[PDB]
Amino acid sequence: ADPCASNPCANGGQCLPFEASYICHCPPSFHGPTCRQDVNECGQKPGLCRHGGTCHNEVGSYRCVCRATHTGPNCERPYVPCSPSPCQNGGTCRPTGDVTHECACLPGFTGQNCEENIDDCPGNNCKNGGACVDGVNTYNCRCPPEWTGQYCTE
Amino acid sequence: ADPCASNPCANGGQCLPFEASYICHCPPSFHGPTCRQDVNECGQKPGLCRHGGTCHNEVGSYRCVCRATHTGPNCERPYVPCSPSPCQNGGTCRPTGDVTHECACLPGFTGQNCEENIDDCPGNNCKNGGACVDGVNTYNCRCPPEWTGQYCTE
Ligand SMILES: [Ca+2]
Ligand SMILES: [Ca+2]
Ligand SMILES: [Ca+2]
Ligand SMILES: [Ca+2]
Numbered sequence: 001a002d003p004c005a006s007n008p009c010a011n012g013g014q015c016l017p018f019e020a021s022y023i024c025h026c027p028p029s030f031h032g033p034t035c036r037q038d039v040n041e042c043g044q045k046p047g048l049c050r051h052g053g054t055c056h057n058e059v060g061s062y063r064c065v066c067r068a069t070h071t072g073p074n075c076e077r078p079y080v081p082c083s084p085s086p087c088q089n090g091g092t093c094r095p096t097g098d099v100t101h102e103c104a105c106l107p108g109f110t111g112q113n114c115e116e117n118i119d120d121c122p123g124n125n126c127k128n129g130g131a132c133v134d135g136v137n138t139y140n141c142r143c144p145p146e147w148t149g150q151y152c153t154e
Numbered sequence: 155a156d157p158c159a160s161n162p163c164a165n166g167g168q169c170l171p172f173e174a175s176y177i178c179h180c181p182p183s184f185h186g187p188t189c190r191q192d193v194n195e196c197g198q199k200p201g202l203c204r205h206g207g208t209c210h211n212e213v214g215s216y217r218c219v220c221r222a223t224h225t226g227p228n229c230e231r232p233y234v235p236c237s238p239s240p241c242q243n244g245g246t247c248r249p250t251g252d253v254t255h256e257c258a259c260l261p262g263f264t265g266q267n268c269e270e271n272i273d274d275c276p277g278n279n280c281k282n283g284g285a286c287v288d289g290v291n292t293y294n295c296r297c298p299p300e301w302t303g304q305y306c307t308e
Binding site for chain 1: 221223232233234236237246247248249250251252253
């Protein structure tokens with residue numbers, strides 16, 4: 001005799017026997033007789049997304065879409081443009097406003113945040129089937145098993 | 155026979171014997187026969203203060219006065235307003251521009267960067283010679299040796 005055998009309480013609801021049937025104790029994220037109805041966290045917890053952010057309800061959670069002036073999962077912290085720095089590949093971040101920034105890239109990279117590595121391979125001198133490998137404003141030839149050299153010619 | 159006995163080479167210049175006299179080997183910061191003339195680092199090293207900063211020569215060193223857009227001893231890093239945060243006493247920094255900020259103080263503090271602790275002592279109820287001690291939007295009475303209590307009345 002185990003009415004819970006069937007696993008009726010979903011999404012983490014505890015199942016307990018109750019009279020002829022069972023009974024679900026639901027989690028904070030769901031509700032209903034089986035814990036299969038999503039809780040709208042935005043409506044039950046107003047101001048969940050602080051500092052003017054928009055709350056979007058999800059199934060089993062929610063997400064906050066912050067104003068440009070704030071960040072975090074609930075917009076709790078102000079947005080400081082160059083911390084954490086967005087500029088990848090050792091570029092230099094410079095603030096340009098309250099919510100804006102600008103990246104000064106090292107030679108060899110481009111993009112808004114130094115994200116893309118310029119393809120240095122066109123015009124390479126890798127010979128005898130050696131493959132060209134893009135680098136820090138340069139290239140390297142990966143030679144096949146019967147060649148050595150900077151260009152696979154030795 | 156020790157011509158250097160007199161300690162003639164100043165500001166860290168090494169003294170060595172040379173002919174009848176001595177001779178000074180000067181440090182980078184000074185020059186002259188005794189290392190007593192200051193070196194003007196600004197003029198001998200141009201661009202010492204990076205990103206448009208002004209170099210002011212000092213005796214035995216120099217100092218850089220940066221543009222608002224940069225910081226460091228030589229203006230090498232850009233200025234990021236809320237990192238390191240200026241707001242003292244657990245206040246919240248909010249950027250308001252490229253080089254400007256604003257602090258949201260916790261209750262009990264005021265000033266541009268939450269620096270001053272509001273004097274909560276006027277109107278205190280510290281009795282029997284007990285001194286008032288300002289606090290986190292509150293006060294405490296430091297009682298004399300024959301009194302106890304929140305107000306020194308027990
Ligand atoms: Ca939800
Ligand atoms: Ca490259
Ligand atoms: Ca100097
Ligand atoms: Ca106070």
